[PDB]
């Protein structure tokens, strides 16, 4: 509709519909970043819709790559993506973006990150999907029953000379 | 060597009217085969010590 | 095989100091080739040249290993068919050699199985070792602040009359004598008497059993020698150590004294070769010459070489290009200061300016 | 051999950025521009500038681009004259290079006239006497070394002392409201710095793409070969000269860094067969700089206010290049690294700065008297500092300590936060009026503010800001006392 | 004062020497790279 | 249908690692700065680079490989093209020469490209975490920045750069490959052994998957040492022009200049200062100008440069050192005295500077760094000229700056925040590292059953990105952050410091000394 212009005043391509379709056809969410890279190279900066689609692919994708990658985390990738969008692109995440993050936290069983995201949605957005809040609490109480509330080695009593400093 | 030289001469358009001449040189770096140089175009069909 | 240039005949065209130009009608031999002067010239000893540059397709510039006295133009020279080769193997143990590999101990013939060229390529990346361990010398300052690494490179930077030679002898007594492996002593531009004293000391300690098996080889090109020899004796001594390291998988000690004279010798010839001097007056190729030499002094997967090199600091100026470039080629650096010695402290090590690579808790306690 | 336009020659030698050209009909005049017409598979055109005549047919030249893919005997065609650059109001708001070609990717520029970059400097009769103070909004400059309109200003400094920052502050304070035009010449500096300047100027509306701009940019930077860096300054200077003469306007000319012009000529001097002089500069250091500097002057037709940044290599002001530039300036601002390390910005050493208009006839008597008193007090304070280190502050007399206490406030009161260094400092900048600065220092000298805490003068503007900071300091101190009292 | 003066007088001597050597090494290079061309004169007329 | 090369002449003279060529009459001729092949055998060629084109027709050649095989009278063929080397993701984890040849271990990019235009760049706004608190706070580094690392021999110049490469391994594994940081480590004139030790060190931490090594050892000719930085950056420009970020490390430019000096003098170039060629500044200048942060219109990729430079006796007045300092956007000065004084890394904050500023810091680090900067400034002056708050916290900040391995962002930022807000005022300076170790690798609240926080715990490594988004001084994270610090401080003082201050036995004293020293090398 309205032409956008870049930092130096040159115009940027705004027709970012085909790229979203490409993102919605990926198998591993690392391939989504490649699409974003191509968009930037083609002077087609991503919009809010593109980032949400990328988050959706991350949540719905099996893994980062065809082969496993050590210490890979969907939550970390999405949070970094949001950091790029808000800070280095000046775009405010909407409710949809945060919901995807909350779904990933619930799905992965990380019930402590869900609490933080829950407050974020209750602070920036308007509340949290009550379905997901209840799901996170169920995961937390399961840990209490099973005793996996904190890593066990932390609970072990230590002393001044009883700590192994690697 | 003469056949290769003629083929190179044909490829070169500048030397269309020039007359082909062959000059033999002895190179101790090659034990077998031969090489042909014409107007900077160099073709190597030679082998040295293994 | 036999070289295609052996027996090639050339004639002397220009003589300036220790630098001689030779013209070959059939073509200049390859660089680093060795040539012998055939004309008698009334000399008392033979004359040998090493090619270092190619002026044209027929002319080549060379450095003489002996004095160029009584050398005339048009003198006849014959190629030897290869680089300067030296004896290798257990036959060399207990013997004294010069830059050319000729025994100067006035004893029986060496009878070596074979010879190998002094100039050789250095070990590649895949042939490097990864073993770090402490060599106990018995000296408090070294063992504490700058511990030495077995199979590593050690440098003793010092001025004139500071104690470089003394420490080397102490290390020899405390390590070499009680060493399972072999040892090579490379004297380069140092006092001739010191070599004689070392030879007597090694015989008394029976590290050289004239009638039995010895564990030490001596290679000496001293101050009196012309610059050409002082620039190649280190290569020959290093070549012998390389053979022991690789062909036998034996641990070797390499005591070089002094390595600075090697760079100084190359500077003297470089001036005559017609090269533009670098800072101070050294040759522009100062770093490259050290790099080629030092990279050969390393421990590979086959064997280990522990090298101890004495470095002379001219005018007590540690910023001189020669010693300055040598720091990067040493695992352990031992800096000696004249003022400390004048205070009665021996050794004169300045610990603040010293360093070591095995000063890592992962290696030492 | 009058008109050499289209004359043909062949490349005879190529060593680095220096190329020898052979002409059968005679080498063109020196400073002539040549184009390499031969197709060498290059991604950029190749142009050369004749600098010397080896004989009646051979000429040595410096290339403006990289000499890659250049072969011997390559054909070369003269352009019929020196290097020409566009001039006029149509260049406003645009970025150019040494050759006068736009590099802003903003479309063709409509040029009605072009002028050679090499021109003869004004003669003695063409000199105008303009003694008027220039208010930069900076306490130190306006007080100790006031600037003069239509004059020449140098910012001598090492690396990292704040030469570039001061230029940005001057632009923000003098160029936004300037009646006339402005020309910025980047010479052998960082390319990113030029980018930041371009963005800032667009934001400040100095360069109005949709409207009317009032500044020109000419960039020859480190990445460029020495040939370009040795002529970019001439190109920008030519643009300013046109605005001065033809348009009769008062123009600003910022240069950063002028030293690179000397450095570039030294790099090529070795290949031109010239024996190096002391330190290692070219023997023609003084003459080449003089010709350029004399062109940067205000004549009877118009006025050029020139601000040039000079790099003092290794903080050695005895170096030939910085020293040679001192005599070609009307106001020198010498920055010191020690001052910066103490947290004082701008890191100006007032004991080494000087100004031509520091005379009662030009400036007000109060201004002259205040500045001299400040300088004398600072000089005395430094001598006392030697005593304070040997004997200690206790041994100083009553008079001496009063000088010490007052002088320390002067040292900290000279500091000022700039509006462009907010990221560096984290505080808003200040613009101090000339009258406020004089009054504030005058009161400080006579002890009107002896009871004010010393730190209240640190990184503030006028006297009013000093009082506010002192009040804030008092309030926080009272809170700390109250907290201690409760404990 | 007697130890820093020597280092000051020793430094100026080195500074002068290094500069002149450095200038005179860039004069040798210019001379060496340059050479006299074929001598076009009436050699027979002698 | 023949593989016809372009013969241009013969080899006339050879002087070490350089050569001269005489052109055969009536031949096409060779172009400047192009690659040529010297036919050492009917099937073997040695690479050379054109450097000079003289009036006589003679050509100056810089040899690159198979030097020993070169002899006078051999034939020379001209490729007619500049130097191009392999580039792509298929080179990562490998050791290569400047010519692209792979070195066994136990797309073509042009090496002479021009730097990005003024309008092709963007302001530096993305941080590059070195992993060291001192650098990340007081000396910010941003992607697309040139940050010199200047110091004396044996001061940590190499270690810090290597640690910076390693610190990206953990980050790259989590975030998308879009924002991953690739590494190009270039070794120039170094020992072959040091390269192998570096290769093993990177492999142990798994950094080879995102890193490649370009080695030109001392034994190699000066030509390779001269081209290594340009080839290394070229490999890094492949990612820059494709919307990705890279980090090029040069170890070190000091030995590159020596190689360039050696080449120029042998080829009859007039010497300059310290015998260096006149155009020695232009060498590094065009090398470091190629490291930039491309604009959104060109992809947004970047190259970060960390050139390393060696001084003598802490003399930064040298020639090449000055030139590099006047080029880079900031300098990290490693001081010998601090290094021997126990401060490691020996970063001299007074002499170090980053011209990018806070723009290269994350929103979380901006607040901590800004306040931290003022405290240290006062701390330096107070001691130079009384347990005031700036002097109490300044010492603890200095103690926290001692490190041996890069620190995760969450651990570092939290510790700095604690020392900033006075949580360490009651902690002795000697015990600060021990306090930090327990905070990071332990949790006193859980140990003593007094932890009531819901999500904020130091063992939840995923909190790093939440912190990097919202800031520590935000309502979401601020409330729980203070509670955790308060509990950790109270528990630490009560259960540990009291016992530590009550130790008098020689055995116990020695045991404590070992513990605290170990804590320095752990966190
Ligand atoms: N460890 C030591 N204990 C006592 N005196 C020492 C010691 N080391 C050196 N000296 C004294 O210093 C003198 C010179 O020592 P040394 O022969 O090692 O010199 P250097 O370093 O080899 O110097 P150069 O070989 O250039 O003469 C000795 O003769 C002795 O008087
Ligand atoms: N942060 C650190 N803490 C403790 N030791 C360190 C640290 N960084 C480096 N070192 C050690 O200091 C020594 C020198 O480090 P490094 O190899 O990085 O030096 P350098 O600057 O590369 O010097 P050069 O390359 O000239 O030898 C090594 O033993 C290394 O393990
Ligand atoms: N007004 C200022 N306030 C604070 N720091 C400053 C100021 N001016 C300069 N600096 C310091 O100097 C750096 C900028 O240096 P710069 O202006 O480029 O100097 P130069 O061009 O002389 O090297 C800043 O990053 C900061 O560290
Ligand atoms: Mg001795
Ligand atoms: Mg600047
Ligand atoms: Mg290093």
UniProtKB/TrEMBL annotation, chain B:
Superkingdom field: Eukaryota
Designated name of the protein: Uncharacterized protein
Subcellular location: Membrane
Assigned protein family: Belongs to the ATPase delta chain family.
UniProtKB/TrEMBL annotation, chain E:
Subcellular location: Membrane
Family indicated by similarity: Belongs to the ATPase gamma chain family.
Name listed for the protein in its UniProt record: ATP synthase gamma subunit
Organism, as annotated: Trypanosoma brucei brucei
């Amino acid at each position: 509709a309205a032409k956008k212009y870049d930092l130096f005043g040159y115009e940027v391509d705004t027709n970012t519909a085909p790229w979203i379709e490409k993102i919605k056809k990926c198998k591993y969410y690392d391939e989504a970043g490649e699409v974003l890279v191509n968009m930037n190279v083609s002077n087609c900066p991503p919009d809010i819709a593109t980032y949400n689609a990328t988050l959706q692919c991350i949540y719905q994708s099996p893994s980062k790559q065809s082969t496993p990658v050590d210490n890979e985390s969907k939550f970390c990738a999405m949070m970094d993506l949001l950091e790029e969008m808000q800070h280095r692109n000046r775009l405010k995440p909407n409710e949809e973006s945060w919901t995807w993050v909350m779904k990933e936290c619930v799905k992965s069983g990380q019930f402590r990150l869900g609490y933080c995201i829950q407050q974020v949605m209750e602070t920036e957005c308007k509340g949290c999907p009550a379905d997901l809040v209840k799901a996170n609490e169920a995961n937390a109480q399961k840990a209490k029953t099973e005793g996996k509330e904190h890593p066990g080695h932390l609970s072990q009593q230590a002393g001044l000379f009883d700590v192994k400093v690697e | 060597a003469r056949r290769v030289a003629e083929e190179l001469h044909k490829g070169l358009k500048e030397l269309a009217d020039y007359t082909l001449v062959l000059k033999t040189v002895v190179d101790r770096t090659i034990v077998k085969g031969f090489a042909v140089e014409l107007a900077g175009q160099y073709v190597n069909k030679a082998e040295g010590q293994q | 095989p036999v070289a295609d240039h052996k027996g090639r005949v050339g004639h002397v065209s220009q003589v300036i100091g220790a630098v001689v130009d030779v013209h070959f009608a059939d073509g200049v031999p390859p660089v680093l080739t060795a040539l012998d002067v055939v004309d008698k010239l009334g000399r008392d000893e033979p004359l040998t040249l090493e090619i270092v540059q190619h002026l044209d397709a027929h002319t080549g510039r060379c450095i003489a290993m002996q004095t160029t006295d009584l050398l005339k133009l048009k003198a006849k020279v014959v190629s030897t068919g290869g680089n300067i080769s030296v004896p290798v193997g257990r036959e060399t143990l207990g013997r004294i050699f010069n830059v050319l590999g000729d025994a100067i101990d006035q004893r029986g013939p060496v009878g070596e199985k074979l010879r190998m060229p002094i100039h050789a390529v250095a070990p590649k990346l895949a042939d490097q070792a990864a073993e770090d361990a402490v060599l106990t010398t018995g000296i408090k300052v070294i063992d504490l602040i700058l511990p030495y690494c077995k199979g590593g490179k050690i440098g003793l930077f010092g001025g004139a009359g500071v104690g470089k030679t003394v420490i080397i002898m102490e290390l020899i007594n405390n390590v070499a004598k009680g060493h399972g492996g072999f040892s090579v002593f490379a004297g380069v531009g140092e006092r001739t008497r010191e070599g004689t004293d070392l030879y007597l000391e090694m015989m008394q300690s029976k590290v050289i059993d004239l009638k039995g098996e010895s564990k030490c080889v001596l290679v000496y090109g001293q101050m009196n020698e012309p610059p050409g020899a002082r620039a190649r004796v280190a290569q020959s001594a290093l070549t012998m150590a390389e053979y022991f390291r690789d062909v036998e998988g034996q641990d070797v000690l390499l005591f070089i004294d002094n390595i600075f004279r090697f760079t100084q010798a190359n500077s003297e010839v470089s001036a005559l070769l017609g090269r533009i001097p670098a800072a101070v007056g050294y040759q522009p190729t100062l770093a490259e010459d050290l790099g080629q030499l030092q990279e050969r002094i390393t421990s590979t997967t086959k064997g280990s070489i522990t090298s101890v090199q004495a470095v002379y600091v001219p005018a007590d100026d540690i910023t001189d290009p020669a010693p300055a470039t040598t720091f990067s080629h040493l695992d352990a650096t031992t800096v000696l200061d004249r003022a400390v010695a004048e205070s009665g402290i021996y050794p004169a090590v300045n610990p603040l300016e010293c360093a070591s690579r095995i000063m890592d808790p992962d290696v030492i306690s | 051999v009058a008109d050499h336009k289209g004359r043909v020659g062949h490349v005879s030698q190529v060593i680095g950025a220096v190329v020898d050209v052979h002409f059968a009909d005679g080498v063109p005049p020196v400073l002539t521009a040549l184009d390499v017409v031969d197709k060498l598979g290059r991604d950029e055109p190749l142009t050369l500038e004749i600098v010397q005549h080896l004989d009646a047919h051979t000429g040595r030249c410096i290339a403006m681009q990289t000499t890659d893919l250049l072969k011997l005997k390559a054909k070369v065609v003269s352009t019929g004259g020196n290097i020409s650059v566009p001039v006029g109001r149509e260049t406003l708001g645009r970025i150019f290079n040494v050759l006068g070609d736009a590099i802003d990717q903003r479309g063709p520029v409509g040029e009605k006239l072009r002028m050679p970059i090499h021109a003869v400097a004004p003669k003695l009769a063409d000199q105008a006497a303009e003694d008027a103070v220039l208010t930069t909004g900076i306490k130190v400059i306006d007080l100790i070394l006031p600037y003069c309109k239509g004059g020449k200003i140098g910012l001598f400094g090492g690396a990292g002392v704040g030469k570039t920052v001061i230029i940005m502050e001057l632009i923000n304070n003098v160029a936004k409201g300037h009646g006339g035009f402005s020309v910025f010449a980047g010479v052998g500096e960082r390319t990113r710095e030029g980018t930041d300047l371009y963005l800032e100027m667009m934001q400040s509306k100095v360069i109005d793409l949709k409207g009317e701009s009032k500044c020109v940019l000419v960039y020859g930077q480190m990445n460029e070969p020495p040939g370009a860096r040795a002529r970019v300054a001439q190109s920008a200077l030519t643009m300013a000269e046109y605005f001065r003469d033809v348009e009769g306007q008062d123009v600003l000319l910022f240069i950063d860094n002028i030293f690179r012009f000397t450095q570039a000529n030294s790099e090529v001097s070795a290949l031109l067969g010239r024996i190096p002089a002391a330190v290692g500069y070219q023997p023609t250091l003084a003459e080449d700089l003089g010709q350029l500097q004399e062109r940067i002057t205000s004549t009877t037709k118009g006025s050029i206010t020139s601000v040039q940044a000079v790099y003092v290599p290794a903080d050695d002001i005895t170096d030939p290049a910085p020293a040679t530039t001192f005599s070609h300036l009307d106001a020198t601002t010498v920055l010191d690294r020690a001052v910066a390390e103490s947290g004082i910005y701008p890191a100006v050493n007032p004991l080494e700065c000087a100004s031509r208009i520091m005379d009662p006839d030009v400036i007000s008597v109060d201004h002259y008297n205040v500045a001299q008193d400040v300088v004398q007090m600072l000089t005395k304070y430094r001598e006392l500092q030697d005593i304070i280190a040997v004997l200690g502050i206790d041994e100083l007399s009553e008079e001496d300590k009063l000088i010490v206490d007052r002088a320390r406030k002067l040292v900290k009161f000279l500091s000022q936060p700039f509006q462009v260094a907010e990221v560096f400092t984290g505080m808003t900048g200040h613009y101090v009026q000339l009258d406020d600065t004089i009054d504030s220092f005058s009161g400080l000298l006579m002890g009107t503010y002896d009871q004010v805490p010393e730190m209240a003068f640190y990184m503030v503007g006028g006297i009013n800001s000093v009082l506010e900071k002192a009040k804030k300091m008092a309030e926080e101190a009272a809170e700390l006392e109250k907290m201690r009292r409760a404990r | 004062q007697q130890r820093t003066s020597s280092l000051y007088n020793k430094t100026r001597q080195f500074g002068i020497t290094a500069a002149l050597i450095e200038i005179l090494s860039a004069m040798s290079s210019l001379e060496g790279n340059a050479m006299k061309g074929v001598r076009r004169n009436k050699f027979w007329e002698g | 249908f023949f593989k016809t090369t372009e013969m241009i002449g013969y080899v006339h003279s050879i002087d070490g690692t350089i050569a001269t060529l005489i052109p055969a009459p009536g031949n096409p001729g060779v172009a400047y700065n192009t690659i040529i092949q010297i036919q050492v055998s009917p099937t073997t060629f040695a690479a050379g680079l054109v450097f000079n084109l003289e009036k006589d027709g003679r050509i100056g050649i810089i040899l690159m490989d198979n030097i020993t095989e070169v002899q006078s009278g051999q034939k020379v063929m001209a490729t007619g093209q500049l130097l191009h080397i392999p580039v792509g993701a298929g080179v990562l984890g490998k050791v290569v020469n400047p010519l692209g040849h792979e070195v066994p271990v136990g797309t073509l990019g042009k090496v002479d490209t021009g730097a990005p235009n003024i309008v092709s760049r963007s302001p530096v706004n993305y941080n590059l975490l070195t992993g060291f608190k001192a650098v990340d706070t007081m000396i910010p580094i941003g992607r697309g920045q040139r940050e010199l690392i200047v110091g004396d021999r044996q001061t940590g110049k190499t270690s810090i750069a290597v640690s910076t490469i390693i610190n990206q391994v953990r980050i790259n594994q989590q975030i998308l490959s879009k924002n991953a940081v690739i590494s190009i480590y270039v070794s120039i004139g170094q020992r072959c052994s040091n390269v192998a030790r570096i290769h093993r060190l990177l492999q142990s931490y798994g950094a080879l998957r995102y890193t490649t090594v370009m080695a030109a050892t001392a034994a190699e000719p000066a030509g390779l040492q001269y081209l290594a930085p340009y080839a290394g950056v070229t490999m890094g420009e492949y990612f820059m022009n494709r919307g990705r970020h890279c980090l090029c490390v040069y170890d070190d430019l000091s030995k590159q200049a020596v190689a360039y000096r050696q080449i120029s003098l042998l080829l009859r170039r007039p010497p300059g200062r310290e015998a260096y060629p006149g155009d020695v500044f232009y060498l590094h200048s065009r090398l470091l100008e190629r490291a930039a942060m491309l604009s959104p219109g060109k992809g947004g990729g970047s190259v970060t440069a960390l050139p390393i430079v060696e001084t003598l006796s802490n003399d930064v007045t040298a020639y090449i050192v000055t030139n590099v300092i006047s080029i880079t956007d900031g300098q990290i000065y490693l001081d010998t005295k601090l290094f021997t004084g126990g401060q490691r890394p020996a970063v001299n904050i007074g002499l170090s500077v980053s011209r990018v500023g806070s723009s290269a810091q994350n929103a979380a680090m901006k607040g901590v760094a800004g306040k931290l900067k003022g405290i240290l400034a006062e701390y330096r002056k107070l001691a130079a000229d009384v347990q005031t708050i700036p002097m109490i916290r300044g010492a603890r900040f200095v103690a926290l700056f001692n490190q041996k391995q890069p620190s995760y962002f969450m651990n570092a930022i939290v510790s700095l925040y604690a020392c900033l807000n006075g949580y360490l005022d009651d902690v002795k300076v000697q015990y600060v590292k021990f306090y930090e170790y327990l905070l990071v690798h332990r949790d006193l609240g859980i140990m003593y059953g007094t932890a009531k926080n819901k999500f904020f715990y130091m063992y939840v490594q995923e909190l790093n990105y939440l912190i990097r988004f919202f800031t520590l001084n935000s309502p979401i994270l601020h409330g729980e952050l203070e509670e955790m610090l308060k509990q950790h401080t109270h528990l630490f003082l009560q259960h540990y410091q009291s016992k530590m201050n009550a130790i008098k036995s020689e055995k116990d004293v020695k045991a404590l000394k070992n513990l605290l020293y170990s804590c320095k090398r752990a966190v």
